[PDB]
Design a binder for this molecule. Structure first.
Ligand SMILES: *[C@](O)(C(=O)NCc1ccccc1)[C@H](C[C@@H]1CCNC1=O)NC(=O)[C@@H]1[C@H]2CCC[C@H]2CN1C(=O)c1cc2c(OC)cccc2[nH]1
Ligand SMILES: *[C@](O)(C(=O)NCc1ccccc1)[C@H](C[C@@H]1CCNC1=O)NC(=O)[C@@H]1[C@H]2CCC[C@H]2CN1C(=O)c1cc2c(OC)cccc2[nH]1
Lengths: 305, 303
């Protein structure tokens, strides 16, 4: 037993990290088969970042302007293209450590592991949730751009995040591996604010199921609710509305405990309306919102990769 | 900026994990060069575990009683020996993925990364502190024994922990890689209590510095304290004593923030005496003690 935020084992991703340099600017890239993926702002000087025209900046670059390195070992660039905010560099060597992989675009509330890297060298791994305002509460210093976020299922690495930016509030923003930002952000040196954040309801419900599984069930009430009435009251407390997909991903936890999803919603509603009244759940006075239903199952059951 | 509990990248350790079976027991082993290290209780029946005379049980085993599997490849055992609570199985194949490594025994309050494994396959990675009472607050299920804890410095893996047991309270206990338990625990099938846990004061102070570096100062005050007066209050709240060595180790964080160590001690004293009053620090409603000064420096230097 025990409940911990847990990262996926990072080895399959470590074997894909490289560095990409254009001029004096070095950041991280992801080497899969014979392509390296990295943030397109590698082509910019610090002064270019104030108001970059990427298309015009990239026309001035050739294959021979890109230095891609696996450690000290140079991989020759043989082609380049831009896809949204990511640069794809074709290299002359297929990565022998390429895992089975997919590129996925995640939803708010989904969690992933971040492999923080500097100069192509992995430094640490931690777990993040995509917030409803499309930021993550990460830990990233100068040099971290191009670090990736991912999930593992069986043998397949699903890459979902590439790091680009730190907002003035100290939270982080980036793209999927097709280079589309999560949220309304742009890769320009401007002050950019995220929307007001909300609490990830589906994950709170997962954590209440985790509590029940562990015999901590004082908060289970005798009511139910409709999904619509729940969503309307939830929004008053700065909680996200539930989607049908949220209801579906809570299905296994509902089956395990015998507590209907909408009955758990009614329990959560009472917690929001009345508070905890000096009580705790899983040892905490705060409702946790960065464990998904999958995070609860996979950690309670011990799935490997 | 930002501050997150962060593990070392686990790839160098993943390449060393194998499965070890003896009789009805399967657990994990650590394959370095031509030796597999695992918990000695792999040899025991359920009946043996009430009072296992390990030397007497092990002399009854042959090399062929140990089945070692690395992925879908069996590794033939060609010798075996026991060092305290660790069994060493010599195999006929060198692990090509053996990293540069050391075996170290960590001190209470220090942190390490755990690669939780089942059936020789990595499941997840997380950070733990060795508690003052020599337990860890892990996440370990049936089959996790033989999972290891480690730190990485440059290219060198320092292994410090091998997993053996879950106490009645839900905390965890294990050994170093020489097979010596951390704490007063024994590898027998009994309910075992730890000593009174205490809070790792130097780590709480480090985490308060992390909070300041990340733009939160609400808990600071205009006061100072002496080291001894701080220690009197710390001990009253079941916190470990702060030594001059701890004060010195906190020097870089003090210099970075301009907050003297004993001024941060006065802030911590006030937090202990008044509580947090419904407020949080770095998203936590409680004072966090599993980040070392090094862990903080690694994420906060240059912010
Ligand atoms: C990322 O570009 C990176 O790591 N680059 C390599 C590097 C190497 C040496 C020195 C600096 C950078 C970087 C990651 C940041 C840095 C600190 N923590 C991080 O997560 N991203 C940026 O610096 C990012 C660039 C890229 C896309 C937009 C551009 C601005 N930017 C910001 O993070 C940024 C700009 C502002 C701002 O502009 C006036 C106001 C407030 C906050 C802010 N953040
Ligand atoms: C570890 O041995 C293990 O994973 N073994 C393989 C395995 C495979 C299938 C099924 C069960 C085990 C195991 C790890 C535990 C299990 C749950 N979480 C963990 O961390 N350790 C033990 O079970 C451990 C063994 C080995 C050393 C001492 C012996 C007892 N023990 C305990 O954890 C233990 C015994 C008791 C107890 O005994 C009467 C009462 C209360 C608590 C307790 N814990």
């Amino acid at each position: 037993s025990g409940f911990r935020k847990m990262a996926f084992p990072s080895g399959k991703v470590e074997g894909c990290m490289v560095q990409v340099t254009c001029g004096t600017t070095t950041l991280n890239g992801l080497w899969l088969d014979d392509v390296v993926y990295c943030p397109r702002h590698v082509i910019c000087t610090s002064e270019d970042m104030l108001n970059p025209n990427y298309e015009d900046l990239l026309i001035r670059k050739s294959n021979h302007n890109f230095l891609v390195q696996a450690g000290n070992v140079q991989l020759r660039v043989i082609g380049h293209s831009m896809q949204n905010c990511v640069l794809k560099l074709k290299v002359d060597t297929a990565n022998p450590k390429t895992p089975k992989y997919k590129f996925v675009r995640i939803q708010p509330g989904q969690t992933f592991s971040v492999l923080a890297c500097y100069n192509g060298s992995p430094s640490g791994v931690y777990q993040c949730a995509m917030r409803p305002n499309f930021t993550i509460k990460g830990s990233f210093l100068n040099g971290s751009c191009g670090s990736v976020g991912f999930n593992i299922d069986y043998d397949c690495v699903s890459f979902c995040y590439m790091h680009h930016m730190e907002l003035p509030t100290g939270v982080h923003a980036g793209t999927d591996l097709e280079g589309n930002f999560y949220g309304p952000f742009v890769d320009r040196q401007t002050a950019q604010a995220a929307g007001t954040d909300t609490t990830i309801t589906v994950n709170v419900l997962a954590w209440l199921y985790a509590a029940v599984i562990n015999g901590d069930r004082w908060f289970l009430n005798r009511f139910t609710t409709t999904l619509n009435d729940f969503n309307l009251v939830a929004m008053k407390y700065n909680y996200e509305p539930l989607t049908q997909d949220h209801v579906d991903i809570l299905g296994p936890l509902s089956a395990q405990t015998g507590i209907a999803v909408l009955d758990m919603c009614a329990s959560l509603k009472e917690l929001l309306q009345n508070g905890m009244n000096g009580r705790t759940i899983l040892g905490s006075a705060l409702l946790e919102d960065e464990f998904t239903p999958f995070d609860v199952v996979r950690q309670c059951s011990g799935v490997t990769f």
